[PDB]
Design a protein around this nucleic acid. Sequence first.
RNA 1: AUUAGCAGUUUCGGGGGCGUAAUGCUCUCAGCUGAUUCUCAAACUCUGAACAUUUUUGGUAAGCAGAACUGGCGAUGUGGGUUGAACCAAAUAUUGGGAUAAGACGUCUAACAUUCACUAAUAGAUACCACAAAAGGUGUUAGUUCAUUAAGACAGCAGGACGGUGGCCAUGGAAGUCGGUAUCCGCUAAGGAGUGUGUAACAACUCACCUGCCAAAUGGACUAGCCCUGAAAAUGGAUGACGCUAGCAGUGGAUGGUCGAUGCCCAAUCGUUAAAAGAAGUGAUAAUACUUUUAAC
RNA 2: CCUAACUACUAUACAGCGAAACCACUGCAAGGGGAACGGGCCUUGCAAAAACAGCGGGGAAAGAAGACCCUGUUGAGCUUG
RNA 3: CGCUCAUAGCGACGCUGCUUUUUGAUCCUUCGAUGUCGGCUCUUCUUAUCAUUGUGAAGCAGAAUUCACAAAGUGUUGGAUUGUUCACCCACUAACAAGGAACGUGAGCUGGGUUUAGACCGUCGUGAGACAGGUUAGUUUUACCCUACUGUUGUCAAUUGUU
RNA 4: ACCUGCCGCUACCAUCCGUUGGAUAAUGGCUGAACGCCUCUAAGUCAGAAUCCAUUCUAGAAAC
Lengths: 188, 349, 217
Amino acid sequence: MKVINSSRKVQIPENVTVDVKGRSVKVTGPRGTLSKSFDHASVDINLVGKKELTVDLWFGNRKQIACIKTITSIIENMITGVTKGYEYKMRFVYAHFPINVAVTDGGRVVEIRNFFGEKIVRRIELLDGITCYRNEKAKDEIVLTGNSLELLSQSCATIQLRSAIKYKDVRKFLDGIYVSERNVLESN
Amino acid sequence: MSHRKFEAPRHGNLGFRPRKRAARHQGKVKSFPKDDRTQKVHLTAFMGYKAGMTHVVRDLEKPGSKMHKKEIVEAVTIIECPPMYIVGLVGYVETAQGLKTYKTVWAQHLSDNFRRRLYKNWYKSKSKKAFTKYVKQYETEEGKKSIEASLQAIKKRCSVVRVIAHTQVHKLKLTQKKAHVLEIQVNGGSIVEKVNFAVANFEKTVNVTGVFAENELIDVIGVTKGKGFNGVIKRWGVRKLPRKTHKGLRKVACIGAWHPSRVSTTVPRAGQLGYHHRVERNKKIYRIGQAQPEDGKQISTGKTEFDLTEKTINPMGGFAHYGMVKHEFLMLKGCVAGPRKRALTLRKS
Amino acid sequence: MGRRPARCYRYCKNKPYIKSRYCRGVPDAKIRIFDLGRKKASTDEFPLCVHLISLEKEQLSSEAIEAGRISCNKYISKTGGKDSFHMRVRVHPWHVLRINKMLSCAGADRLQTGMRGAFGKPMGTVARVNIGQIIFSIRTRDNMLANVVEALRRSSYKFPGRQKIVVSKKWGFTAYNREAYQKLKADGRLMNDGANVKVITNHGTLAQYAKDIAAAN
RNA sequence: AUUAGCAGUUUCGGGGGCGUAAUGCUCUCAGCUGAUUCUCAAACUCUGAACAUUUUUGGUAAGCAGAACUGGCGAUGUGGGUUGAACCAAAUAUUGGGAUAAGACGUCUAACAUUCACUAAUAGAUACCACAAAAGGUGUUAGUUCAUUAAGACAGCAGGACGGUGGCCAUGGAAGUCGGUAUCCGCUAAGGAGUGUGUAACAACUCACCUGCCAAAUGGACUAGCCCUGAAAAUGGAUGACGCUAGCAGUGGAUGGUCGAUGCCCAAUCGUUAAAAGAAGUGAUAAUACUUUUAAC
RNA sequence: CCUAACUACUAUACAGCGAAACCACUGCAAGGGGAACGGGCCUUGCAAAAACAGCGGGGAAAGAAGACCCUGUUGAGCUUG
RNA sequence: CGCUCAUAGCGACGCUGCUUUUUGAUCCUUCGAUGUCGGCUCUUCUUAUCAUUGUGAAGCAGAAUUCACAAAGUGUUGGAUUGUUCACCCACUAACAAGGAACGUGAGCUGGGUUUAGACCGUCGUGAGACAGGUUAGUUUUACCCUACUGUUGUCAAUUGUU
RNA sequence: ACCUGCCGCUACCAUCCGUUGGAUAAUGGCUGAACGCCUCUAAGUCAGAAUCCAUUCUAGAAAC
């Protein structure tokens, strides 16, 4: 009816400093730092030494259990990312009407110019912290690197959403910018 | 029944619905543009006076529009805009249910506007003679201290402020021993500056040129032409029996129906069609008119090129009956609210 | 009845009418057939029986029944064939529905539409069933259970209300369970009847008997 | 009234196969007979039951119409169901106090605590009663049965996924996979003469099928609580309102406890009745057309 | 079409002059139940003296014991084999 | 069926609902009299959404169409004929979607029908007369009360300062 | 009577003027579980309606 929830432990590598002021994380690694908020579901969240954070709450339900699993997972990704920066590469698809993709390097803004006949200027400001760069792979691809996996991915998705044709057939065009090489990291 | 037509689009608008005799004899608005400007250069509002309409040929300014350089006529509302004499600075402070009158400050050099709202007032009369009893600023040295105290406090304490200005209608054609008082909320820069400079300006007198530039749009205000009580026909733009065989009326048929079993607000009825407020916007402003020191007239012609003469904007005969421009004025785009000799008001967009 | 919506009759009420020398003016039943698959199938080969039952007490229209039978007669073929289904339905429609017509009216009335001489005329033949009373029944081989339950399931849609599907514990169209069926073969009391079993039993309805074992054997 | 096949018949009915054809056998199909099977037949019955509730005829129904038994309402109210002619309690002389009934107890509004679950929904909130159904939900809770699992499971990811063989056909291409029919054997840890994607059909890839690792549970078909979907209509609106939600003041329980009728208990007062008494607290009066007592209402 | 203006006159204000029909009580609403469409009952929304001139939604407005229709062992006017 | 292919789009026999915009059934309400049908006028609301806003499916390549969600915010036409809603044509339009409000709306109108008397025919009647048959002509009263609305004064007929 | 007729009213029988922010629904995604995979959802979050609510405009309370 109401069942106890197992603790979910995670090892932390010695590259980083997970501090936890009142159930709310900050994980400082090589690439910089990411904070995040927790205590949505009233969960407990402890540090044992400084190579082991553990989440738990000793009564509840399936619902609570799931939440526990989630939070831990989220933090793991953050840990990974703030030590080794994440890379979401989005390749674009048009050469019948050719495509013009541009990038403001200063403000970290992609600007997609001409696709599917359009003469408009589609400027999508990237989310906080993340960046992009133009890369010569095969006269294609914008590579978006960042350390917050959640945010970078979201930004990419936004861009994808914005670069499609909201009237008439979804297969007359298959064109636009979409994600290609993801879950990718680096150590170079 | 369905209806059965479709259209019946609400004859009228329910956004002017109380359609009664307006509060202020002058143009008045309880709203202002917000803070992103310099300082006293941006005074926001001004007060003018209507004086009729003329037409002006100019060229268009639109490509692909019966030529961007071809001539078209348009009407214009010309409006005698005497310079104003700011005199109180007033500090609003922002609170749990909007803004309130914390405390004003007034200039020592002048207090004749006060007086002007007095001869036309009182009925027993204890304090007509020249005095007061709603608290006003007198005194050279002792009141100075008070003023100083006020000034700092408002400056420190919260929220934006306006200036008690007023018109000089004595020197206008129409004679009036009371003048029209107004607020011109001040925008931009910072509060310290804003509070400070009002004091400086008391003696000084602002010009319509001080507020607006010659290509700037207006937030125009006024009070509509006072036709007087009239029935539902041209108060809402209804219909009638054009071949005519009816013992009732020009007045409409159903007023609600046995529907909510009573009659609603939302029915056009017999009331009045005159002093109402309203605000029309985006008026181009075509030409700011110059002051006339009773000698020259090229100043109220405008250009000499294309104008090709020297004349006032005032007609051949001029204005012997109506508001005659001897002062600064304004050529707007055609039509403003209010009759030919009315106290308007202006805001910037 | 396809004229009416059958909401009108899906509650078992009013003492039950019939065809007779009293109710002559009836139409003919919709189903005049209770024969789905291989009727010439022996009792000693199809050891399974599944049943469908009306969960609810209610009437059960002839038309509805008919409709149901071709969820077990199209679906007879796609799954297995004729050599699996043996169906006797296990309900008929004796009961009749009347119709006091006022269709007469489509603009005005003659007043005979009113409740004077109210009593309706026969129109709609229908069955009456309790909750237990069985409504479909497939006697079959025991390699066909999920490919016959889905016939029953299909049928259930075409009945009003709630319908329960089941498998019994017998050889179908027999009293005797699968446990007591093997007895018959073993004890030499199995007597075939091309469909049924008579089951040989000693008894006495004579004067001095011994053919009561030696009759069918 | 009515469903099924079975058997025994066929010099009686019909048409075939068996010597030409039949009824000579054997068949499906007629008729008759015998044993079994389906539904039992308000006007059938061997047997045989103890406005409202219950029964019940007409009627698709109706706050329609027509009966039965009891109860009410109506010619009695009060408390309770928000309110309400009929439902609940329960019947009214007039009062006092005590304890109850139905109904409540976050607040309106007198009345509370404790305890276990369940619901997360624009909800859900006491008969009559102000509607909801068939049919869906990998929503959550609770169960039931069979299957699998240390002979190493489940999901995951990784490896393998063959020989005869291009199976025979159609084709002269269809070589597992436009497509017809058979659908076997070897060998192996395992592999359908093949689950699709793809291709001219193949090739290529994947699936069934197996195994590598990780390492303890897994899988499924149903039942049934609450919730959701289904679930649309006319002024602005209804658990009566507010409002409530992670124990709730919602639902379903558990253990006490409290409020509360003109009901009940007790007391008082007045009348009525029945019975009795007479100097009516009328102990000098001399009353019975009157007063009093006792009891019941 | 699409309404417009104008004058008379009444209305509108005054001065005199003064009226009726009608009137259980009375006049704010939503919803509920209730002789099933409430102003009053109930529960909510609310609420602000005294009034003016227009308007016609409501008062299941008013005028008329509906004569439409039925009934009563009520009549009449007329008709006929 | 839709080549093929149950559910793109439809959907048999069959089954469950909702609706009150059809008409019946009923006769609770009204015969101390709710003025009956339509049209004009005018608002309001409902959504069962025709258009448009934004979305998702399609047998959606484009074009146009079809299907569906959110959503009632804004539109929802001009005419012939008909007493007429209903009906049917012509023409526009993005579209000319269905409805509700005492079958919205008669002290708002009109009276074209339906509604008396006069009267023509046809059928019926021995006849006086009859007709959910046709034809024609036929007085539409009252707000100077309360409320509701519209605007117009005035007031906490002082909340316990004037102005 | 007719012509002409200012002032004045008035005509799609003329002229001028009709804004920008958040919040979302549907819905499309993200990260990511319950259910080692998966999944727009559960916790969480992004984009997003002629929609809502503000800004605008009208009126201005037995409100200051």
